[PDB]
Design brief:
This is part of a larger assembly, with chains A (78 residues) and B (368 residues).
Chain A: H1 2-17, H2 19-37, H3 42-53, H4 59-77
Helix pairs in contact in A: 1-2
Chain B: E1 10-12, E2 18-20, E3 34-38, H1 43-54, E4 58-63, E5 81-85, H2 91-98, E6 103-106, H3 119-136, E7 141-145, H4 157-173, E8 178-182, E9 185-186, H5 191-197, H6 204-207, E10 211-212, E11 215-216, H7 217-228, E12 237-240, E13 246-247, H8 248-258, H9 267-271, H10 279-289, H11 300-305, H12 333-337, H13 355-366
Parallel strand pairs in B: 3-4, 3-6, 4-5, 6-7, 7-8, 8-12, 9-11
Antiparallel strand pairs in B: 1-2, 10-13
Helix pairs in contact in B: 1-7, 2-3, 3-4, 8-13
Classes of the chains: A mainly alpha (78), B alpha/beta (368).
Bound molecules: NADPH dihydro-nicotinamide-adenine-dinucleotide phosphate and diundecyl phosphatidyl choline (PLC).
Diundecyl phosphatidyl choline (PLC) is lined by residues 112, 114-115, 289-291, 293-297, 299 of chain B.
C-alpha cells in the first residue's frame, strides 16, 4: 500500500528535477488512457497487427473459423 | 583597492572645506571625507561601501532593510560606517543622510515596479529628490549611477526613466553633477550572471539574444572611488563597459560547459535548460506574475529590452579617461561561475578554465 503514500511525493519531485522528461512521460501516459477511455482503438489495432504478423490466432481469424463452420453446418442440414 | 586611494594628504572640497588624511591607508586610517551611499545595501553598494570604508572614509548608509545593512559594518573601523533608517517618501530622513557628507553617491534604481513604487518614482522621483536635498546641504560632489542605454526618448520604461533621471539630476544639483553609465555588471551574486546561471530560464530563445558589453563590478566600484576623490571628474558622464561584446546566448552556452551540464546528452533538455516559448506567452506570463507573484520576476519591460542591444554613447568618457584598463570577462568568468560547477570538489581533477581556455570555448560555442 506504500505506493499510494509515496506517489504524490515522487511525482512532484520528478517534475521539479526533470520537468521536460516528466511532461513527456506523463503526456504519453495520459494519451494511452484517452485511447482506452474514449475507444480510439489505437492500442487494440496495434495488438491486432502484432498477432497477424506473428502467426497468432487473431480476433478476425477466430471469427472466420466460426463463419466457416456456420456455412458448413447449414448446408449439412439443407 | 590600492594602499592609499588619494593623490595627496590634503583635499579641498568644492564646498570650501579642507580635509586632511591621516595614516597609511589601513583600517585605522582616515581620508577626512564623509560619503553617503544611497542604495548601499544593494549589489553595487556593498562593493562601493566596502571600498570607501576600508580606507577610512566615513560612510552614511541609509537603509530600509535592517537585516541587509548588518554586513556593511564589518567593512570599516569603529565609527566609520553609519546607518540612517530612511524612505524615499520621507524627506527628513533623506536630509539626515546628507547633512554631513561631502560626497553623495546615488545607487537607487529599479527595473521593476511594485504596489508602492513605480519606475518613475524611483528612477526619477527619488533621484531628483536626493539631488536637491544634497544641494541644500552643501554637498560638494554628487555621483548618480544610471544605466548603459539611458535615453529620454526610449521605448523601454527603464531606459527612458534612467535617461530622464540623468537630466533631472543635473537640473537640480547643477552642471557639476557626475553621471555613471555602467554596463551589465558581473561579480559574485551578480544580477546579470544570475539569470544566465539559472537552469529553468523560461523563454530564453527571446530573452537571451540581447548583446551587451559586460563590465567587472569591482572596476565599476573602483571607478566610482576614483570619481569621488578626483574633482576633475565633476560634471562628466562616464560609460563603463568592457572591451568585448557578448550576447547572452553565447554566455548561456559557454556557462553550460563550465557547469558541465552537457556531460549527459539528455540531462540539459530534460532538466529544463532550454524552455522555448512564443513571445505572446512570455508577455502574458510576465504580465500575470506582475499582479500575482510577490517577488520581482521577469517583467514586461525586461521583455521589451531583450530586443534592444547596448549602444555605447561615443560622446561620453570611458575607463581610459580615469586611467584604468577594463577587465576582461574571459579572465573572470570561471571564478564567478565556479560556485555553480556541479561535482568539482576535487573528485578527480578540476577543470580550471584559464583566460586562454575561455576564448577557445567561445569559438566552440559559436561553432554549429
Ligand atoms: N548589471 C547591473 O546590476 C546594472 C546596474 N544598473 C543600476 O546601478 C545601480 C545599482 O544597482 P545594483 O546594486 O546593481 O542592484 P539593486 O537592484 O540591488 O539596486 C537597487 C538599490 O537601490 C535601492 N532601491 C531600489 N528601490 C528603492 C526604493 N523605493 N527605496 C529605497 N531604495 C531602493 C535598493 O535598496 P534595497 O537593497 O534595500 O532593496 C538597492 O540598494 C541601480 O540603480 C541600477 O539601475 C544599471 C545597469 C547594469
Ligand atoms: C496568496 C496571496 C499572495 C498574493 C501576493 C500579492 O498580491 O502580491 C503581488 C502584488 C505586487 O506587490 P509586490 O509584491 O510589492 O510587487 C512586487 C512583485 N512583482 C514585481 C512581481 C509585481 O501585491 C499586491 O497586489 C498587493 C496586495 C497584496 C496584499 C496581500 C494579499
Amino acid at each position: 500500500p506504500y505506493l499510494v503514500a509515496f506517489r504524490p511525493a515522487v511525482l512532484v519531485f520528478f517534475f521539479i528535477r526533470q520537468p521536460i522528461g516528466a511532461g513527456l512521460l506523463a503526456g504519453g501516459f495520459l494519451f494511452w488512457q484517452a485511447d482506452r477511455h474514449f475507444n480510439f482503438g489505437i492500442r487494440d489495432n496495434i495488438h491486432n497487427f502484432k498477432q497477424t504478423i506473428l502467426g497468432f490466432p487473431t480476433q478476425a481469424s477466430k471469427w472466420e473459423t466460426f463463419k466457416q463452420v456456420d456455412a458448413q453446418k447449414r448446408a449439412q442440414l439443407v | 583597492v590600492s594602499t592609499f586611494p588619494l593623490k595627496s594628504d590634503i583635499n579641498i572640497t568644492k564646498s570650501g572645506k579642507t580635509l586632511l588624511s591621516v595614516g597609511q591607508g589601513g583600517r585605522s586610517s582616515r581620508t577626512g571625507f564623509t560619503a553617503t551611499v544611497f542604495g548601499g545595501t544593494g549589489f553595487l553598494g556593498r562593493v562601493v561601501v566596502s571600498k570607501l570604508a576600508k580606507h577610512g572614509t566615513n560612510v552614511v548608509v541609509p537603509f530600509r532593510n535592517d537585516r541587509a545593512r548588518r554586513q556593511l559594518k564589518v567593512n570599516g573601523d569603529l565609527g566609520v560606517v553609519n546607518f540612517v533608517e530612511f524612505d524615499i517618501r520621507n524627506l527628513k530622513s533623506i536630509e539626515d543622510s546628507v547633512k554631513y557628507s561631502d560626497i553623495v553617491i546615488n545607487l537607487i534604481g529599479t527595473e521593476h515596479f511594485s504596489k508602492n513604487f513605480s519606475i518613475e518614482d524611483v528612477n526619477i522621483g527619488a533621484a531628483e529628490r536626493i539631488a536637491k536635498a544634497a544641494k541644500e546641504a552643501g554637498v560638494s560632489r554628487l555621483i548618480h549611477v544610471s544605466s548603459y542605454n539611458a535615453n529620454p526618448s526610449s521605448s523601454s520604461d527603464f531606459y527612458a526613466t534612467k535617461g530622464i533621471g540623468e537630466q533631472v539630476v543635473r537640473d537640480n544639483f547643477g552642471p557639476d553633477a557626475t553621471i555613471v553609465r555602467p554596463a551589465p555588471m558581473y561579480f559574485r551574486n551578480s544580477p546579470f550572471l544570475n539569470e544566465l546561471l539559472q537552469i529553468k530560464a523560461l523563454g530564453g530563445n527571446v530573452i537571451f539574444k540581447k548583446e551587451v558589453y559586460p563590465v567587472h563590478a569591482l572596476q565599476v566600484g573602483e571607478a566610482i572611488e576614483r570619481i569621488a576623490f578626483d574633482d576633475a571628474t565633476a560634471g562628466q558622464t562616464y560609460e563603463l563597459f568592457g572591451k568585448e561584446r557578448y550576447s547572452k546566448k553565447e554566455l548561456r552556452e559557454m556557462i553550460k560547459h563550465i557547469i558541465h551540464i552537457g556531460q549527459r546528452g539528455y540531462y540539459p533538455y530534460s532538466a529544463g535548460f532550454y524552455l522555448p516559448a512564443p513571445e505572446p506567452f512570455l508577455y502574458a506570463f510576465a504580465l500575470i506574475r506582475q499582479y500575482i507573484s510577490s517577488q520581482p520576476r521577469f517583467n514586461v519591460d525586461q521583455l521589451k529590452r531583450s530586443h534592444i542591444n547596448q549602444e555605447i554613447d561615443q560622446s561620453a568618457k570611458t575607463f581610459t579617461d580615469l586611467g584604468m584598463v577594463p577587465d576582461e570577462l574571459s579572465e573572470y568568468l570561471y571564478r564567478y561561475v565556479k560556485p555553480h560547477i556541479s561535482y568539482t570538489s576535487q573528485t578527480q581533477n578540476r577543470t580550471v578554465y584559464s583566460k586562454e581556455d575561455i576564448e577557445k570555448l567561445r569559438d566552440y560555442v559559436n561553432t554549429p
